[PDB]
Each structure stands twice: as structure tokens, then as C-alpha cells.
Structure 1
Amino acid sequence: KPFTLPILTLGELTNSRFPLPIDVLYTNPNESAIVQCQNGRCTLDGELQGTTQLLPTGICAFRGKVTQQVQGTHWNMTVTNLNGTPFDPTEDVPAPLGTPDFSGQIYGVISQRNTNTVPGEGNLPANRAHEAVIATYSPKFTPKLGNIQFSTWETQDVSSGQPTKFTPVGLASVDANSHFDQWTLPSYSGALTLNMNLAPSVAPVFPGECLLFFRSFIPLKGGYGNPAIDCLMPQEWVQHLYQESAPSLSDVALVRYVNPETGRTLFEAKLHRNGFLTVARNSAGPVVAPTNGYFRFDSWVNQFYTLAPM
């Protein structure tokens, strides 16, 4: 089966690591961190890796039940799989699929719809929702053990024992004590633990090459900053590759970024079998080009193919 990519343009793609549109392509050749994100991980032949799942609504989401308030106002939440089935910690994944894959204070909304209905309200359940923050660097962030905590500004109106959804929106801030580092993994089983079942790190191996990312700017609840989240492939590529499961005929798919108006190739890139891009570029920053561009698959090549400089 021939390998293909979506023909969605840059302005028609979304981030696989946070629910955001892709804003710009981006490089940073002198990055010192190991790049080993766990969402947006899929091989070119369709194998999801890390904590990657298919729903855009599942990225950095949680589903479960609040147990009790804990002595901002903190609350303990059991977490299930996003489909509602109990999370089995013996499954060969780092954490429930969709779990955030970076250190920071993730800001969003906790909502609840009660299981029990009220006769005097037309046999309908009660509901509530409040702003909430999840500190993924906290020892209390133990999604691999089926349990996390969140904090709220709201002091009372969260219910114990009720179905609970976290909808991510952005970060609480990028203050130093919020520990935002997009390449630092959470410790999924808690303090002083070793993560397991991780998607592998990615890196260029050929001289003159660097990673090419799909970058999105992330909202902030407060503070000064212009934070971004870089993914290796957009969510729609993950969805496409998963469904197609086309055999990979070599280690690298050569792709060309094309302006569909002019048919012109702006640059070429290597799309590696583990699901990431490299380019030959000697600078950091955005790729300044119209957002109607898209990557076109041109041919299978080997690891030693030399790219035209961007």
C-alpha cells in the first residue's frame, strides 16, 4: 500500500501535544534537552507510541472521579482510561493515553455531571464546572497509578464521588515556580520513580540537520510570557498514519513543503520512520512562509540522503 500524508495545509492542522492549531514550523538546532515527547508519537507504518491516542479532545485530557478534597484548594481524582474503562497499570504504556507529556502547570476546566438524578429537578443530574490547575511535576501527579490531584480557586463547589472531566485550555503561567519545560517528562508514577514504556527519543544524526517542529502558542491564565508547544507531527498525521498502516519501504520518506498556489517547493525534509522531521537548517526560529503550504511525499530514501539547505 502506497505511503501518503494528508494534504491539509499548515493552517488546517492541529498540535498533537496540546489542543491548539499549528501556528508555525520551527527549528532550534542548539536545543540541549533530550526530545522525547510522548503525545503525537506514531511510526510511519501506523504504530502509536507513548501515551498517544487518536482524539484531538483526548490530548491532555483526564476522565475519572473526584474522591475527596485534600488538605489553592486541592482535590484528589481517580483517573480512568478516556473511554471510561479502568486504567490497567500493567498495560505497556507510560500512563493513560492522553496524559500530558511535559512539566508545567496545566490550566483548564474541571466539570462534573452527577450519576444520581434528582426527582424534583425533572429526574436530571446536577452539574458544576470550575477552573483548575494540574501541576504535572508534583509528587501527587501519579496517572500511571490511576490518581492525580488538581487545584482550584473555587473553595467548595466540587463534588466527591462524581464523574469528572478535565478540559485543558492552556498553562497557569510560566513563572519559575510553575516549572514549565516542554521537554521534561512528568514522573508518571510519582516522586523518585522511573518512567516506562516510553516512545524513544528523537534526534538528527546526519551533519547539518536539525529537528523540524510544528509549533503552537499556548494560552496563559496569567503572567508574562509567550509559551509554545512543539510537536513532531500534527494530530491529523497521527490519525492518517494509524489508519493507512502503509509499509515503510526505507528509513526515510523524503517530503517537500509546497505552496499549492504556485506549485513551488519551498524546502525539503526527511520524515523518519519513527515519526519526526529533520531539515538542513543552520538557524533557530520560525519558518516564515505562507500557511497554505503542505508536505508532499515524494519518495523513499535512505538515512544518508543529503537535503538541500533550507
Structure 2
Amino acid sequence: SKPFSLPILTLSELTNSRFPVPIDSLFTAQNNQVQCQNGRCTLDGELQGTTQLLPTGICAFRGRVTAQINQRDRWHMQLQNLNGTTYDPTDDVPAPLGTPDFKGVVFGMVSQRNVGNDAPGSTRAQQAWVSTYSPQFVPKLGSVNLRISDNDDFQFQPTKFTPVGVNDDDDGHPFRQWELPNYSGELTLNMNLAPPVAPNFPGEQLLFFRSFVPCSGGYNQGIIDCLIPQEWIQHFYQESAPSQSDVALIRYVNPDTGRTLFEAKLHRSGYITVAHSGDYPLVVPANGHFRFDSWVNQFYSLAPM
């Protein structure tokens, strides 16, 4: 069997798998549903949820604007897959890969480049917002609607949305990173979801890779927590190493000193638990990183943090 491994990367050499920014810190959370759809991959390399491989694809959209309606979510964007191929709403996924997996507003920019009969090759770009609370946020069905800055400089042409940050909506719908959008809109149930994750052994908590992402006004901290970073997902996809048991024991090491600072359980479906009680932001040395130790089972007792 090909041996399992992690890439050797410090926290600042890691990308959040749920928003296209670096990891800032590690955080373990008090128990009490975690069911994110980006940043989902098994240790033997099976992508799940809406997870795809490119960091620049996370919370991005690609397609064409085809209509406008007289509502706040004005501009109707018919989606393609991020690689430009035609999107199939009957595929066994929750939504096009890369679609945001939280309730809130994503802010960034839209850009267009004309094709066909109308001024082919002409371009434009401007600030835009996507509300995942919108009744027109129906990416599983094949479209989302955009709010933009200048309604007079926008055409029915090929369009890309590049995310920059997140926020609460100004009408009081809050940014809730653990609440899934309704991918097919009002009165529909989400399907083909990656499953919820939780500790299943006494005294254990989830460990997250945390980023503080940009916000566009107000005091929101911009916290987005992922289960495993994007480079680990990319690595597992390449390696496809067989999982020899349900849990990989991993050690956080300081390579300068060679010491192990703490240990953790990396579960086969792609998340980490540690032995601790209470919310705790880790403050650990900058050169620190995890290494694979050995395969153990679900009932292995971790050294307390």
C-alpha cells in the first residue's frame, strides 16, 4: 500500500478551502451542526460536496448574464461550470462546484468580455454582491442573481464573479458560516450533501483551520473555519493513499526544535478532533505543522491539550 502523508506546509503556507484566502490560525470549538460543502475530501482522495481543486474557484461563479428583474437581486446569471463546460443540474452534486456554502453576502467584482455580434472583445468590471439568502440564489437549478454598483454599464454577456470578502446584509440577514444556503431556493430541500461532522468520543472537539476574511463595513470578524485546508485536499487527490483504518493519528511538530507540541485525530472522511474542553484559539509557533504518525481506531485516547 502507498503510504499516507500530509504536505509539509506552515499555517501561512495554507489556503482556506472555504474562502480564497490564507489560513490565519487554528481553533478548537465547544461542542454544540457542522456540514460545510466546500473543503470536503476523504483521506484517500475522494472530493465531496461542492469541493473542487482550484483555490481561485472557491466562492467564484462563471456564466452569462441573460436577464434583469425589478428587484434588489437584479441581474440573472446563468451558470456554467468553472471550467466553462455546460452545467448539468441533474448531476449528483449539491450545486456547481465552488458555490458558496454559507448564508450571507459575498462581495467582490464582476467582469465581462463580449462575444458574438455586440462589440466582441469589449470588457468591463465593477463591484458586485451575491446574497445567498436571495430567493433567486438557485445555483443547483443553474442561476444566481447579482447586485451591482452601476446598472447602466452591464450587458447580457459572458460574466465572471471574483469574490473578495463577506458580510452581514444591510437589511439584517446575518453572515452565518454554518448555515447552508437553499441551493434550489424556497421550499426545496438540499440534496447530495457531504454529511455532517462531529466528535464521537468523550472529551473531544473539532479543530478548525481559521481565517479572518475581508468585510465591507461594520464590525464582523469575518471568521471562516474549514475542516482541512485546500493544499491537503489537493495532496490527497494526487496521492490516493489507501486508508488503513478509520483514524490517522497526526502530530503537530515544531521543526526548529523537533518537539511535538500536541496530537490530534484525522478522521478518514477528512476532519480533525483534539482532546480539549472549551473554545480555544491556539497560539503556536509560526513554523509549526502536522505530520502523519500512524493509523489508530476511533476509540484511541488522545493526549489532552
What's the CA shift for 1:178?
A: 3.3
What's the CA shift for 1:152?
A: 1.3
- What aligned pairs does 1:256-275 form with structure 2 within 5 A after superposition? 256-275=251-270
**Candidates 160, 165, 180, aligned match of 2:160:** 165
Q: In the alignment, does 2:132 pair up with 1:136?
A: yes
Please name the residue that 2:13 is paired with.
12
Please name the residue that 1:102 is paired with.
102
- Counterparts of 1:267 and 1:74 in 2: how far apart (Å)? 50
- Counterparts of 1:155 and 1:239 in 2: how far apart (Å)? 39
What's the CA shift for 1:171?
A: 1.2
What's the CA shift for 1:285?
A: 2.8
What's the CA shift for 1:138?
A: 1.3
Aligned length: 303
- Counterparts of 1:203 and 1:118 in 2: how far apart (Å)? 53
Moved more, 147-156 or 213-222: 147-156
- Counterparts of 1:273 and 1:93 in 2: how far apart (Å)? 21
Q: Confirm or deny: 8 A CA contact 2:29 2:205 kept in the other structure.
A: yes
Q: Confirm or deny: 8 A CA contact 1:39 1:52 kept in the other structure.
A: yes
What's the CA shift for 1:173?
A: 3.8
Moved more, 151-160 or 232-241: 151-160
Please name the residue that 1:55 is paired with.
54
**Candidates 181, 199, 202, aligned match of 2:176:** 181
- What aligned pairs does 1:20-169 form with structure 2 within 5 A after superposition? 20-30=21-31, 32=32, 34-71=33-70, 74-116=74-116, 125-160=121-156, 162-169=157-164
Q: Confirm or deny: 8 A CA contact 1:175 1:223 kept in the other structure.
A: no
SS in 1 for 2:115: strand
What's the CA shift for 1:29?
A: 1.1
Q: Which amino acid is the alignment partner of residue 177 of structure 1?
A: G
Q: Which amino acid is the alignment partner of residue 81 of structure 2?
A: N
Distance 1:73 1:88, change over 3 A: closer
Write the deviation string for residues 162-192 of structure 1: whole angstroms up to 9, x where unpaired. 1100000001446671321100001111111
What's the CA shift for 1:283?
A: 2.3
Could you say what the CA RMSD is over the residues aligned between the two structures, in angstroms? 1.5
- Counterparts of 1:280 and 1:83 in 2: how far apart (Å)? 41
- Counterparts of 1:306 and 1:85 in 2: how far apart (Å)? 47
Q: Which amino acid is the alignment partner of residue 95 of structure 1?
A: A
Q: Which amino acid is the alignment partner of residue 140 of structure 2?
A: K
SS in 2 for 1:211: strand
Q: Confirm or deny: 8 A CA contact 1:45 1:242 kept in the other structure.
A: yes
- Once superposed, which parts of structure 1, at least 4 consecutive aligned residues long, lie more than 3 Å away? 116-119, 172-176
What's the CA shift for 1:84?
A: 0.9
Please name the residue that 2:192 is paired with.
197
- Counterparts of 1:189 and 1:302 in 2: how far apart (Å)? 38
Task: Structure 1: state its 5+ residue gaps.
Answer: none
Task: Structure 2: state its 5+ residue gaps.
Answer: none
Write the deviation string for residues 265-300 of structure 1: whole angstroms up to 9, x where unpaired. 110000000000000011213101122111000000
Q: Confirm or deny: 8 A CA contact 1:73 1:153 kept in the other structure.
A: no
Write the deviation string for residues 76-106 of structure 1: whole angstroms up to 9, x where unpaired. 1000111111111111000000000000000
Q: Which amino acid is the alignment partner of residue 36 of structure 1?
A: Q
TM-score by length of 2: 0.96
Q: Confirm or deny: 8 A CA contact 1:73 1:155 kept in the other structure.
A: no
- Counterparts of 1:73 and 1:140 in 2: how far apart (Å)? 7
What's the CA shift for 1:36?
A: 0.3
- Counterparts of 2:255 and 2:170 in 1: how far apart (Å)? 41
- Counterparts of 2:239 and 2:172 in 1: how far apart (Å)? 43
- Counterparts of 1:176 and 1:43 in 2: how far apart (Å)? 38
- Counterparts of 2:44 and 2:251 in 1: how far apart (Å)? 19
Moved more, 211-220 or 281-290: 281-290
What's the CA shift for 1:153?
A: 2.3
- Counterparts of 1:174 and 1:141 in 2: how far apart (Å)? 14
SS in 2 for 1:145: coil
SS in 2 for 1:239: helix
What's the CA shift for 1:225?
A: 2.0
Distance 1:80 1:267, change over 3 A: same
Q: Which amino acid is the alignment partner of residue 86 of structure 1?
A: T
SS in 1 for 2:231: helix
Q: Which amino acid is the alignment partner of residue 49 of structure 1?
A: Q
TM-score by length of 1: 0.95
What's the CA shift for 1:118?
A: 8.0
